[PDB]
Write a protein that binds this DNA or RNA. Structure first.
Ligand SMILES: Nc1ccn([C@@H]2O[C@H](COP(=O)(O)OP(=O)(O)OP(=O)(O)O)[C@@H](O)[C@H]2O)c(=O)n1
Ligand SMILES: Nc1ccn([C@@H]2O[C@H](COP(=O)(O)OP(=O)(O)OP(=O)(O)O)[C@@H](O)[C@H]2O)c(=O)n1
Ligand SMILES: [Mg+2]
Ligand SMILES: [Mg+2]
Lengths: 437, 437
RNA sequence: GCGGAUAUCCGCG
RNA sequence: GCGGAUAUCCGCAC
RNA sequence: CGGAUCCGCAC
RNA sequence: CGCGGAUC
């Protein structure tokens, strides 16, 4: 073991190299030179300004302060104007309010506009509370900016860093707040092992209490959950990972897992041995950002799942993959084929009228009474899950999320069996089916 | 073809002919003759006495009237003595107190001991009511015996005459009580179309009312429901027939529906086109009466159905058949085969102690978290409905009804597909599957 | 965009 | 029984 | 009191 | 499971 030998070991893996530091430190100096000239207000916030970023996650967040007496467009316009005319490379994003994401001296940079604001109960735009976070954090974070790095690394290598919808994990700000609250990666990790789905972590009041859900109170605004977009499953994965760390520590907790990657042959035989219907719904990925695509991929996956559920194909698990040009909604069902015939249900024997209407209909098999009710044998539209999803996708594309549903209306495909294993989804399947090596 | 004429022609199918009527009359006289000289008290009751018996169903009922100071042991002993000593050939059967069945001059007779009783207030056995039933109906039935005969014939033709557990229909008594209420067959049929599962027919008060469920109030003991063992499905089945009749009457309603009987090859094709799984449990028939066997057959049929439903084989319908020596429980299932793997479900993530226990267990696949709970993949014991039941019948003969389960304990089989259609159940499978001719 | 809550319409029953 | 659709208020993505 | 089923009650 | 009631 030797936990602190492992902690020191992990430091060199998580702390950015001298070349990196100065690399961004040279892009920071130049970025100032170009703004100071254009004369508007700015502050550096985030993982760079507080000196908390990871080794290899060098991005610079620069908010622009704007007068209280403005309008949404006068922000959107003046901000996006500055970005492109202050960075070498540039593009666009559509979050809360559209912002610039550029590259200066080879270093990625975000540029968000927001309101100046006196004290943070005005909450005019929600991104208005970001410089306040910096204010509250700097100096309170001093001497601990390595314990923050250690945590972010611990997460990043277990896919639960980032509060983006691609992840639903811990935001960088939440990592900083935890280290303030507990005072050390390790004190955070130990205590986490007893975190519950109803744990409230009031940083400003230095107390843990019971609540409605897992709430971390923002010390800048008390009615804001810093951990709001952390999924229940990911909190569950973190709590367990801490337990498993403490109980038997290792350095491997800080190294990302390399994918499974096995023969299209072995995978074929696992499905053969599980006896399940495993299939994917392929289509062209829409041209939108991650914060937009992923929540949709999730809805699409849920809606089809609930279909498989409803039509009694008894699905096991679902998964998705976004790739270069394609997307893949992946499913595993316990029922490969279902009987053509099924039960309809009619009116109670009493209801004289609906009964003559129910028995009027033309059918291959004579109806019958059961527990004072008419029932009838009818034929299903489709007989396998694949045939079912193929029908559902065509008729219910609109309900599978806006941008994704429209990309299905244009083109979609059901791929199953040995054909499936030829697509770039092998790791996402083994993950899903819970394959060990 | 004009209602009123059809009833006329139906009478011929329903009324005992010249020969049969005085076949029993000569038997009635020798029975009086043999009883009188034993100086014992008796009344003739039932179908014969009130002269409502159906064609080909000639049976004398004689209740012996013992003074109410005897003992459930004396009238029991004396009753058999007189019963044995008055019939040509005799059997003994047990229902209330054991009584004597047999023959007099080629006519089937029942000789039942019962207490005389002055009032229908102190009723200490079901058989004690019969004298009073007759005393109430006699004379109130005169002028209407053919109308009762019609009603019994209508029911008998559609397999819902008899209150015995084998049928769960309308008793002979109930039919008479209906004709006394509605005055005629037809006025019964007309008005029956508006019976509900809550209808209450108090004959003594000559009022129809709304209660808790279908309840025909015994005029002799108004706490008794004369319609007690009429099923809901046979109440419905009748209520529907009357409607179907009135609307378009025919003699056809009074003749029995001769069984389908189709090629063991066309039936093979149906199960194919339905894509269901059809099988039977076959076992040696226990040696007990029908009112013991059928209730159990129902229970056994239910428990195995419930199993298949619980186990996710999606059962469609069930039926049973009781031949001379063997019994057959029949099932149709929507799932011919389910996957080997299923999901198990463990503790919520927070439960340290129980997660450890749950995650140590040896498995072929990595368990996973979902909605804050550990779930794990596992292997099913059986994978087809046939295998499933074999497992279930072996382990759970206990539950499938006392006498029946004991025979299933002894020996049972599962016959399915090509092998099944060779058995004597062809007629019950079709009805269950609702196959038209 | 996604999720929740409130209000309202369409469909298979 | 559900399966969709539409508006307003809320919350999240930085 | 020979019997089996079904519903209510306390578990 | 066990008891009570109803049912044929
Ligand atoms: N889900 C989020 C993301 C961001 N922020 C605010 O925006 C700042 C910068 O955002 P971001 O780049 O996403 O996080 P960083 O703190 O910069 O950490 P990192 O860059 O390593 O992700 C945060 O410090 C915080 O004040 C927030 O409150 N909630
Ligand atoms: N559910 C029943 C069945 C029968 N009985 C009584 O038992 C008598 C005779 O029984 P049974 O021979 O079985 O029927 P029958 O009424 O004589 O006519 P059938 O045999 O044609 O049905 C009837 O008069 C009736 O009073 C009764 O009280 N309740
Ligand atoms: Mg940052
Ligand atoms: Mg009789």
């Amino acid at each position: 073991m030797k936990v602190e030998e492992i902690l020191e070991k992990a430091l060199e893996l998580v702390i950015p190299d001298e070349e990196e530091v100065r690399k961004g430190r040279e892009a920071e100096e130049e970025l100032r030179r170009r703004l100071d000239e254009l004369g508007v207000e700015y502050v550096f916030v985030g993982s760079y300004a507080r000196n908390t970023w990871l080794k290899g996650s060098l991005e610079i967040d620069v908010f622009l302060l704007f007068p209280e007496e403005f309008s949404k467009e006068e922000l959107r316009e003046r901000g996006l104007e500055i970005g492109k005319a202050v960075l070498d490379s540039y593009e666009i994003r559509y979050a809360e309010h559209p912002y610039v994401h550029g590259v200066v001296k080879g270093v990625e940079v975000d540029v968000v506009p927001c309101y100046k604001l006196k004290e943070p109960k005005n909450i005019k735009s929600a991104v208005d509370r970001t410089p306040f976070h910096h204010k509250w954090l700097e100096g309170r974070i001093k001497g601990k900016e390595n314990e923050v790095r250690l945590l972010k690394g611990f997460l990043k290598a277990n896919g639960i860093y980032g509060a983006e919808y691609k992840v639903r994990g811990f935001s960088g700000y939440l990592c900083e707040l935890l280290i303030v609250f507990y005072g050390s990666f390790l004190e955070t990790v130990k205590n986490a092992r007893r975190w519950t789905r109803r744990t409230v972590i009031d940083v400003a009041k230095g107390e843990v209490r019971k609540g409605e859900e897992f709430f971390v109170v923002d010390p800048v605004d008390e009615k804001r959950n810093v951990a709001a977009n952390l999924s229940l499953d990911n909190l569950a994965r973190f709590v367990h990972l801490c337990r498993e760390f403490m109980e038997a520590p290792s350095l491997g907790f800080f190294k990302p897992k390399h994918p499974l990657e096995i023969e299209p042959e072995r995978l074929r035989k696992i499905v053969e041995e599980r006896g399940t219907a495993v299939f994917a719904v392929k289509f062209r990925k829409p041209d939108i950002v991650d914060d937009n695509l992923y929540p949709q991929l999730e809805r699409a996956s849920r809606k089809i799942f609930e279909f498989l559920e409803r039509e009694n194909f008894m699905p096991l698990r679902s998964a998705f993959k976004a790739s270069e040009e394609f997307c893949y909604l992946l499913f595993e069902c316990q029922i490969k084929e279902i009987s053509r015939v099924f039960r309809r249900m009619g009116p109670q024997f009493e209801d004289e009228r609906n009964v003559k209407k129910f028995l009027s209909r033309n059918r291959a098999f004579r109806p019958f009474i059961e527990n004072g009710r008419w029932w009838a044998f009818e034929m299903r539209k489709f007989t396998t899950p694949e045939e079912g999803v193929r029908s559902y996708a065509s008729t219910h594309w609109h309900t599978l999320g806006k941008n994704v549903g429209e990309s299905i209306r244009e083109y979609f495909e059901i791929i199953s069996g040995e054909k499936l294993f030829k697509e770039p989804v092998t790791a996402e399947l083994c993950e899903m089916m819970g394959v060990k090596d």
